């Protein structure tokens, strides 16, 4: 159910690099890939490239992005983040409260909490989750 | 097992994710207290709180930045990287309570009490050989 929600994700990044592009300046791009610490201040611009590829993933592929997928924030952050600001990140798309995380029908926000756990399976590969 | 085994994954998944960014809040002295081979007296257990939580919540503490929940995959990872077997315990028993992924998404509190926790933590480092500590390390104060 969700591992399908993902996999379509996964399969979107790993197609962006290359046929599409972001709305990413190869400044915003080191900027978001790098291993350069996330310093305070840079959560505006940390969140406005996160989003871009949210988003834009999102709008190459046809889905709406009124709620953004956690599966998407999931996966645009695990494939573009680096380590140094993983964790950071998520407590940073939180921040983009845009859905309520549906966890047992409650509209519950996306808290950062999970995020890492979403992100720590997709790096580690797994995501046949359920 | 198919299923402690996704686990385990998902820990040595961690590993890599910890090594790559060495970034600690912790002065050289801090850092083998941390990691030395002597024992955590029962008076050491606010020193080791700190050194332990400074592994898990990573560039955050480095950084300002709030501290938020992490999976147990994670902290066991953090453990068995970094503490010795001597503290490797005391250390789950200071982590006690974490939660493993699958209930931090589905929203099932199974808190993962620190035996359990020690249990687990141990072999995610009985099983983990492009992992061990090196010296590319100590350049955090």
Known sequence: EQSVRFQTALASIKLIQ??????????????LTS?????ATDRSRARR?????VYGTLDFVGYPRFP???EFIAAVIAYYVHPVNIQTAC??????????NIING????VKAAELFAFTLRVRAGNTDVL
């Open 106 to 109: 409650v509209e519950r926000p």
């Open 91 to 100: 407590l940073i798309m939180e921040g983009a409260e845009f859905t309520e």
């Open 68 to 70: 953004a997928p956690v």
């Open 49 to 53: 490239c996160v989003e871009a590829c």
């Open 35 to 39: 291993n350069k610490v996330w310093i």
């Open 18 to 31: 290359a046929s599409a592009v972001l709305d990413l300046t190869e400044d915003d791009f080191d900027f």
